[PDB]
Each structure stands twice: as C-alpha cells, then as structure tokens.
Amino acid sequence: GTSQWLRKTVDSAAVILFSKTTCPYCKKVKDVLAEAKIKHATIELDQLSNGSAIQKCLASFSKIETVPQMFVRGKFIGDSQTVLKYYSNDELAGIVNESKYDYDLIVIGGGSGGLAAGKEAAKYGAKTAVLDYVEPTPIGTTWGLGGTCVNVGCIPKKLMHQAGLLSHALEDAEHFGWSLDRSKISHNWSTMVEGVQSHIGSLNWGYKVALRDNQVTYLNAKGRLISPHEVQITDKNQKVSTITGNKIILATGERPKYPEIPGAVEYGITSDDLFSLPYFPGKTLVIGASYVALECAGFLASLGGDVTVMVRSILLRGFDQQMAEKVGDYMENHGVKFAKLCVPDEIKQLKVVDTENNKPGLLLVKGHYTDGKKFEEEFETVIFAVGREPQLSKVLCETVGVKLDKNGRVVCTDDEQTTVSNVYAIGDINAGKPQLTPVAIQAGRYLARRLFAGATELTDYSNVATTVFTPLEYGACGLSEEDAIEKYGDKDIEVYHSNFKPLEWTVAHREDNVCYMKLVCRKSDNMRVLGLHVLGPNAGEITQGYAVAIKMGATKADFDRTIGIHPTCSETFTTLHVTKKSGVSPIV
Amino acid sequence: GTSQWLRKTVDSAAVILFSKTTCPYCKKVKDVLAEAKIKHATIELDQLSNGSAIQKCLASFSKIETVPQMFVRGKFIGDSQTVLKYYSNDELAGIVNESKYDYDLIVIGGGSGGLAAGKEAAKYGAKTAVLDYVEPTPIGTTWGLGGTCVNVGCIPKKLMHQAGLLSHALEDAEHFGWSLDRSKISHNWSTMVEGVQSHIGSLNWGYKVALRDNQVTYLNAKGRLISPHEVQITDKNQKVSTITGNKIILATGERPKYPEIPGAVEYGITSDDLFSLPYFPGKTLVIGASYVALECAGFLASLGGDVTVMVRSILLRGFDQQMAEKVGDYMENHGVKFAKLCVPDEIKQLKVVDTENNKPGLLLVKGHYTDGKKFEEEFETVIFAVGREPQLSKVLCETVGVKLDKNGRVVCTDDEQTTVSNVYAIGDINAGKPQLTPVAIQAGRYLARRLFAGATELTDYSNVATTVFTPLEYGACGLSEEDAIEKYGDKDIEVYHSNFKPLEWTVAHREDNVCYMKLVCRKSDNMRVLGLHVLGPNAGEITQGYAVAIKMGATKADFDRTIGIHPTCSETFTTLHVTKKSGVSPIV
Numbered sequence A, B: 001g002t003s004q005w006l007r008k009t010v011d012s013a014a015v016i017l018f019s020k021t022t023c024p025y026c027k028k029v030k031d032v033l034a035e036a037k038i039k040h041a042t043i044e045l046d047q048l049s050n051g052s053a054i055q056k057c058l059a060s061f062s063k064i065e066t067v068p069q070m071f072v073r074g075k076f077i078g079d080s081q082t083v084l085k086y087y088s089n090d091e092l093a094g095i096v097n098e099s100k101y102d103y104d105l106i107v108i109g110g111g112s113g114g115l116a117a118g119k120e121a122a123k124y125g126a127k128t129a130v131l132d133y134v135e136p137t138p139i140g141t142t143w144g145l146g147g148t149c150v151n152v153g154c155i156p157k158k159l160m161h162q163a164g165l166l167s168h169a170l171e172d173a174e175h176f177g178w179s180l181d182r183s184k185i186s187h188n189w190s191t192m193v194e195g196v197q198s199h200i201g202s203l204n205w206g207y208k209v210a211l212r213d214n215q216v217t218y219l220n221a222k223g224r225l226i227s228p229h230e231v232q233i234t235d236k237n238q239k240v241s242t243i244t245g246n247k248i249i250l251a252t253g254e255r256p257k258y259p260e261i262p263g264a265v266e267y268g269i270t271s272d273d274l275f276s277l278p279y280f281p282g283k284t285l286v287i288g289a290s291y292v293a294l295e296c297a298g299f300l301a302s303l304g305g306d307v308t309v310m311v312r313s314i315l316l317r318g319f320d321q322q323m324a325e326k327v328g329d330y331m332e333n334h335g336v337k338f339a340k341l342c343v344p345d346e347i348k349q350l351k352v353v354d355t356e357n358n359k360p361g362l363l364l365v366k367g368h369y370t371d372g373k374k375f376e377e378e379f380e381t382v383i384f385a386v387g388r389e390p391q392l393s394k395v396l397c398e399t400v401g402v403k404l405d406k407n408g409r410v411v412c413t414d415d416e417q418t419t420v421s422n423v424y425a426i427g428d429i430n431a432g433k434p435q436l437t438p439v440a441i442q443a444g445r446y447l448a449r450r451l452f453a454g455a456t457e458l459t460d461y462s463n464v465a466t467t468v469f470t471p472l473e474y475g476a477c478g479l480s481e482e483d484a485i486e487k488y489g490d491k492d493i494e495v496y497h498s499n500f501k502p503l504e505w506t507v508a509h510r511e512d513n514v515c516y517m518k519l520v521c522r523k524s525d526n527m528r529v530l531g532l533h534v535l536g537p538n539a540g541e542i543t544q545g546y547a548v549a550i551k552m553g554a555t556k557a558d559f560d561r562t563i564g565i566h567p568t569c570s571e572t573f574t575t576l577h578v579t580k581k582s583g584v585s586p587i588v
C-alpha cells in the first residue's frame, strides 16, 4: 500500500532526499546539495501523516531507518557521513550523473503541455530534453518555439479579436461625449500584424530563455520514438542521430485539416497562415463552423472585411445549440454573411497572389446546397476551418506498442500512461480530453511531479470551463441543456434564464435583449447546477469564477444566497428566477 | 415548533390560500380568485416536508382539517363551497378588502430597498403604499423616483467611469492598427451629461410604471412615522394628512455630509450635484478619500480635467491597505494629484457661478498640512466626499420608540425588526450592515416574503463582495489581509499573490507589473480562502463568480483543482503559487 508508493517513487525519481524539517544532519546535506548545483526532490517525513511507515519502509532499500537518506535513479547512495565523504573526495558529481540513459526525460513537442512538463521536471533534478519542430504549411509558413496557442492560436486570435472590439469602442465613444467621427477612420492590417508578431516573438525568446535558466536541453529537431527508450532525431541539416531517455512524454499537438477537393491545398489557407499574412485577406470565404471559423470570421468583419461563412449543417457542433444559434444571429446582424447547408466542390485560381505589390489573389469557389442548388462566387481569400488532427505516424513507430484510438489519438490511463509503461501522453493527442491550453499545462505539470517528486495528485478533466471569443463572447461551464435532458430526462431538469443589457450599452444605444444567460439544474439533486451559460461582453472573466463553485458542487440555493456586485453583468446570475417551464418571457 | 410558524403566517398574510397541487377543488378556487383579480399567497402542502402536520394544525383556526382553506388578514373565510357562495352573492370583494388599516404595508423611502420590498409585497396580495420625496441640495438640485444609486450613485458614476475608460481605448486603437490620432480628440461634458440624464429619466419613468402595474399606490410626499401604525405625509402643496398601515418599512437612506468650515455649504458641491452639473467643473479639488472621492477624481482626470485630491490620513479606510495604496499609486501616475496629510480650513468665493454663459465660478481654498505647513490654492469647483449620514429626526418621532445607535442608524434584529414590533428597517439605515444596493434589494425582497407569504429565509450579510471603480478597478470578497492577521495571528495566515498583465495591454505598450491579485488563507483550517483581492480591468466581472465559491467554503485546493479559461485575466487565480513568506518576487 504505502510500500508500493515508496517503491514507485524511489525508482523513477532522479535525485531525491528523504528528510525531516527538524533535523540538522538533514540540513547539512541540503546545504551540500548545492553548493554543488545539484537539484533534487525532497520529501519531509515529519510533514506526512504516515511518515512513520515510510521511514520503516525505506529500510527495505537502504538497510537503515534514519534520515537523511539520499537516492539517485533508484539506488541508495548513503546517509550524512557517506554523502560528505563523496563530497570532500570529489566523487559526488559523478555519482549524481550516473544513468543508463542520456536523459531522465525526453519531451516530444515544444508546445503548451510539453514546455510545462519539461520545466517542472527540471526543478527536481531530472536531466531533461525538449524537442520541437514546426513543419511548414503548404505555402511555407513557419514559426518559433511555444506551440499552436502561442504562435497560431489563442494568443494571436484574441489580440485580433481585441482589434475588432476596439471598433465599437470608437463608435461608443461619440455617444459618451468624445469628438471623434468613427466614419472617417479605417484599419491598417499590416500595422496590426506587425504588433501581434512582435509580441509573439517576445514569447518565442522568453521560452528559450526559460529552458536555458532551468538547465533543459532544447533541440530544434523532429523526434521519432523508435523503441520504448530510443528517440530518433533529424536536425536542421537533415543529420540523423539517436538519443535515449528513461521517461518519454508525447506532446506533439495537431494541425489543421483540408477537405479533399481540387484547389484546396494549392489556393486556400488555414489559420496557421492567417496570423502572419503579409496582406489583408480582402473579400474572404471561411469554410467551416467551429469556434476557430466563427472567431476568425468575426474579427475580420469587425476590421472592415466582406466575410462569408459556409456552413455544412450547424454552428458549434458539440456546444449548447440554443447558445450556438444566438452567437450566429448576432454575427449575422453585424455584417457576417452565411451560406447555410452548403459545402465546397472546387477552388479555381483567377489571379496569383501579388507578392510584389502585397495583395491577395482572386479565386472562384463552386459548391452546392443540400437541396442540390448550385453555389458559385468569387473571393480574394479562402480560409479552411474544417477541424484538426494529429499525425502520430510521423512521431511514433507502430512497433513500439503505443495503442491509438479510431481517430489516431493515444489511449491513456487516468495518469496519462500509454500502453507502454515508461511512455506518457498529454495535451491535444490525449484521446477523449478537452483540447485546451490550460488543460495541457496542468496535465504536464502534475505528471512531472508524479514522475520525479513522488506526488500523487491527478489532473481533473471534468467541468472545464470554455469561452468562444466571437464578436459577442460565449462562456460556458458544464453540460449543455440538451445533454442534461438526455441524461436525466426532461422532468428532472429545471432551467432558469434571463436576458440582460450591459450598463455600458445604454448610453451607446445598443440592443436591449440580445445578451442572455441560463442555469441548467437537476431538481432531484437539490437543484444542483449542471451547466452555466452566458452570452455577453467579457464572458470569459464572467465565467471563470463560477467554475470554482461548480467544481465544489454548487446548487441554485448557493447562487441565490450570494449577493451581487452592482453595476455588473455577472450579477444577473445571483437573482435568476424565471423558468422555461413557466413560459414567462425572459426579456427585462 | 411548526405550530407557531403557522400562527405567525396567518396573522400577517393579507390573502393566503392553503392548497394542494393534486386537488381540483383548489384549482376551482384559484381560478375564481384570478378572475376576480384578487392576488394572494399560496402554500402548497403536498410540496412541503411536514405538510401533513400543518394540515392538522390548520384546524386550530378553521375547525376543519381539509384543503383548501383561504384566510384574509388573519381571519378564516371558508372552504370551497363557502368561497363560491361569496362569489355568487358578490360578497367577496368586500371581504378580501376589509382591513383595520388603510394599507397592509407602508414603505417610507422610494429607493433601492424600498421599491424592491413594495413590489414583492404587492405580488402576494398586500395593499401597499410607497412614499418618496427628494429634499433638494443647498444649491437646489433635485431628481426623480428610484433612490441614490439610480439618480446620484452607482448608475451615473459607472456611466461616467465608462466615458473615462474610453479615452484609453482611443489611445489603444492606434497600436492595434486604427487610423485615428488621439492627440486631436477632446471631450464634451454637457454631451455626456445629456446622455446620462436621459437614461436616468427612463429609469424614473420605468419605476412609476412598475408601481402602477402592480397596483402599488405611489405618493410623492415626505413621510413621518408619528405612531407605530400612523404615518404623516406632506405633499407638494404642503398639505398634511395621515394614513395608516399594518406593517411599516423604513428605507430612507442617507445624504452627503459637509465639513463644519466657512464657505463649504455656500460654495462647494457634493456627488448629489455632480451627476447633473450643467457646466464642466474645470480645475477641481476633491476633499475626502473614500471610494466616492477616488471614483469621481478618477474619471474627471480621464476626461481631461485638472484634478487634485486632499487626503486627511489614508486612502480607502476600512479596505485592505496594500490594495488601497496600489490603487492610489496608479491614479497618481495617470494624472491625479494628491495633497497628502492635509485638511481644509475655509472656502472663499472669488467669482460667482456664471449661470447664464454656463461656466463655473472661482474659489480660493485655504487649509493646512499635518506638520503645520499651510495650503492655499484656487479651483473652479470644490467637491466634498467626507461621508454620508442618515437623519431620522426628519423621518421618525422619538416618542414612537425606535432605538437608534450612536451614529443615528436603526438597531435591528437579524430579520430586520426594530424595537417596535410592526416596524422594520432596510438598506443604508440598518445599523452595522453593508451599505450596498444589491444588499438593500435582497433584504427588502426577503422581508416581503416573510411578512406576506410565510417565508422563513433570512438575508445573509457576510462575505459580500465589492468593487471600487477607480481608473484601475479593485474588486474584493472577504477579509482584508491585516484583518485576517489580527483575528488569527500572523503564523496561521498564508498569502498567495502574483502580478499580471492583461493580454490586451501587450500590443498597447501598457505597464508590465501593475495589475495584482492575492488570496489570503488560514493554514489551520485547510487553507480556507479568507479573502480575495484583485486590481485590474473588469474587476467586478472577475470577482463576482468567486463570491459563490467563497460563500461555499472554498479552500486553496478548490482553486488549484479548477482549470483556467485562456486567455483571461481571471485565470491567474487558478495557478497561484508564490507565497509572501517565501520572499520570492511576484513580478511576471
């Protein structure tokens, strides 16, 4: 029980000291380590409730029962007298660098999860390597260390979203007394891209600095796991070599899909290319209906573009569909055109991209609606947002034994372990997990602590909150209304809802009953809050706090007894009273 | 136990039906009442814990044990046959309307708490009157129905705060690619005031419409309680009269104080006048250091004014003083000037207000610093924010016997009852309670349900969250750090903190290490979160959701195991890890 924990901790930890806070012999060892720049984990037996058992169980390893005890990669090294003997005899550094492997830990992938896992393992003395490589897009776009979010995801798209929100700030400003005239002001795309790319470049640099200051080896190379302990690397010069590591963490992420139609790869782009595009896209078609598709179409329209979205069936598949529809109704009322129930058949090139004068090309798009009618239109840019996928047959030889699911994602235990006992997987390629940056970071850090510091805490993947950053934002935590009804039945579900109007919108003459929120509850479990949903400004800031209360099991009575902050949008959640079953209107 | 709840409910409700959902004899009675336009409360016994004991207990009043039973103002009226006998003989209106008093409920004070209590009472059948009168300021300012928040408080000051935030939006837009030159844009005070006052006027009108559509008598008159059940009223022609009511609720609020010095009343103004001032203030001095003073000084500086604040001792007395100092340092770095440890001695008039050409006067302010050094400077406008007080001598005859404290506030039990048994107090005049608008609204709604619908729920006044809307906003829920250290001792307190930078501030070249947040936790109680503090944009939307978690007993591990929403400011709370005791820097 406890004995199985100590055996697992001693075997994978790299350098670990078993100690007591009260002991001066322990402190003198801590002082020698280091002094010699030796990083190590530390376990304070007098802090754990069953420290007395662990102390006794240590003897099965060292034949002794006192503290301090210092281990290196599963082997007992000695007590106080024995460590100092190794110190003053110049023997200690060679002991702590003894390893059957090149590294204690190899991370494949330099993104949100990989960077987090690597930095955390180094903090407990694990000798660590982080591999990262960015395969170019079809037109050759490439970027720096840090992953999809930092370079071509959350970070550049929220910045561009903010550029879009600022257009309504300029409008709202006249109503509040500022002299400017919004209709005489325009937007410069390349100025915005330059500022976004400057910030991304400082994140690239900061990560290389952080790996250096933690003694992590960074290799800009493509990794391939060929046996449980061997990683084959190909570098910037196509030179090939093999390195070994004790533990492996796969964290390679995904890349955008293209539909299998003529002209797609040749003449269109994806979001990988959009955030550093040297020219404004101009008249744009977005193909898809994911949050990537709706967020990108949304800010392009706000920046003055002529934007159309082509929707195969529904918006935001997998999210609450009433919320999805309200999100789309708002974008359509503020400029974004929709071609509903429609798929593309081919893209035809009329103008090549004008790389000299810095202008987009011109394309002809042909498709069809679900009733057979035809679609034909010209656009300057075609953006595909039709999902994302890993390509683990490029990271992972089939002979190693890592089981994959139907979609090509790694099947893992609830401690991130794959079917091969020393190989783990985190982030987007972990099958069945929410694909989100804060999830990948938490999974990476907690895994690093279990591998190298004897921690036990697991990552909790339930009820992770989300926010879709459309022109009007949409934040959520928990089940959709239709999922709650499907799971418990309509008679056990109660939904409280209300419209609302931000106070900032009054003087600026904006819509009265467009913002909206609801709580979906379970009658038979004390009116437990099963899902929360809000459409409105700053929806992410609104939603985050409530996710702690949902984690804790919050009910409708808990919301009722909490008092609101006034004047805020978020306070509407503390006074909700109209139910859907009542049939009373939710307008205010 | 159950006995005396039923007694209290029946003696107090105006029209109450004890019913069952399954019974069609009640459904026949309910429809008779809806058709006759008789509002009433309804106690469904088949949906209560011990509904079978009340059924028995009801016979102490009716001599029958069956359902339905209908009561009017304490008196049993009949079963299903006896009520339809009154409906067929058309004796029913006269019975439901007969009362010992003119009204079941008189509300003195038509503001946040008073309007809320009156409307909720009228739902359940109570014959309700709501009195409101706005005594003019010394220079004669006056406004309409709705109270301090609506007319001269939360609503107009956050609207003016938003006009100030938009100035930095115009600045930020350049860096995001928009083509405006912020240097060449100015602000028009009177344009702002017109927009703000038009919204307030639509809220005055909305309240009068709401009162009428609930059959609430609204009297624009000054009320004085002369006896426990008698209220003397004086209308706009100084016509005196007397009405009577069963229950009385006092909700008359407070007004600003003036310091006892020459010139202040004559030549200065307060917040009561600021929000409808017809001229721009020009060069302004604010005297005080509360949230009113800092909030007003904040947006006046952002609108281009020349603003000085005169501080006796400290900023934001009663709030966490590390947070208060960070607030004031931000204001000082963005154009607010402070005269520290200084008080005023007199205000001298140099120019009279040019009420024709719409211009302020000119004033000479004389005062001294705390060491003894003298202060003397000219300003166009002087605003006093040195606190607010009630004046119940205007409202309340000392012979009625309602106990006040040494401040003049009403001493109440935990269910809002005064020392006279039919008289209650709510809102700012309730002694020791937080003086906030959502608190008044909840207090008054919950009391109305206890008086007239047999509810038992009390208002919870603990851990109510706040937000100070200074140029950088400051939200808080729970104890300040000094208050926790004092109550539990410095060794039982751990504090997690961190600076942060909003993503939106990166491209706009704003400051790196100014926003800040902290969790104040108790070690010996599972690291319970005693207080949450955040300085940054949108701080009210950030804090609100966490108030629910804090109401539920959240610990640091509850925050840890919740996943962030990326990219937001609020997510920084889910990964805090630097303690104050460790001495590591909180910078980014």
Ligand SMILES: Cc1cc2nc3c(=O)[nH]c(=O)nc-3n(C[C@H](O)[C@H](O)[C@H](O)COP(=O)(O)OP(=O)(O)OC[C@H]3O[C@@H](n4cnc5c(N)ncnc54)[C@H](O)[C@@H]3O)c2cc1C
Pocket: A108, A109, A110, A111, A112, A113, A114, A131, A132, A133, A134, A135, A146, A147, A148, A149, A152, A153, A154, A155, A157, A221, A222, A223, A224, A251, A252, A253, A254, A271, A292, A394, A395, A426, A427, A428, A429, A435, A436, A437, A438, A440, B566, B567
């Ligand atoms: C447009 C867009 C917007 C998004 N917005 C948000 C948002 O607002 N919030 C949010 O939470 N999530 C958002 N996401 C999702 C978020 O980016 C991902 O969930 C997250 O980045 C996944 O992290 P990861 O570590 O699993 O993979 P990644 O961050 O993709 O890192 C994997 C890295 O490994 C590299 N690599 C691949 N193969 C190899 C190899 N063989 N050898 C070496 N290196 C290799 C890849 O090139 C990449 O650099 C967005 C995604 C997109 C596309």
Ligand SMILES: Cc1cc2nc3c(=O)[nH]c(=O)nc-3n(C[C@H](O)[C@H](O)[C@H](O)COP(=O)(O)OP(=O)(O)OC[C@H]3O[C@@H](n4cnc5c(N)ncnc54)[C@H](O)[C@@H]3O)c2cc1C
Pocket: A565, A566, A567, B108, B109, B110, B111, B112, B113, B114, B131, B132, B133, B134, B135, B146, B147, B148, B149, B150, B152, B153, B154, B155, B157, B221, B222, B223, B224, B251, B252, B253, B254, B271, B292, B394, B395, B426, B427, B428, B429, B435, B436, B437, B438, B440
């Ligand atoms: C500048 C300022 C800013 C504020 N900002 C906020 C904020 O952002 N958030 C927040 O939560 N709170 C804020 N407050 C506090 C909030 O306004 C009060 O807590 C709230 O208005 C209290 O409501 P009330 O019903 O107790 O009294 P009031 O709202 O003051 O209503 C009492 C009413 O009764 C009238 N009256 C008085 N005497 C009589 C009489 N004899 N007969 C008839 N009528 C009478 C008064 O004129 C008034 O209309 C602010 C206050 C100020 C001054």
Ligand SMILES: CCn1c(NC(C)=O)nc2ccccc21
Pocket: B133, B220, B221, B222, B234, B235, B236, B237, B238
């Ligand atoms: C006694 C108070 N009374 C006065 N009195 C004056 C102007 O002396 N003006 C009023 C206006 C509305 C309601 C009541 C009013």
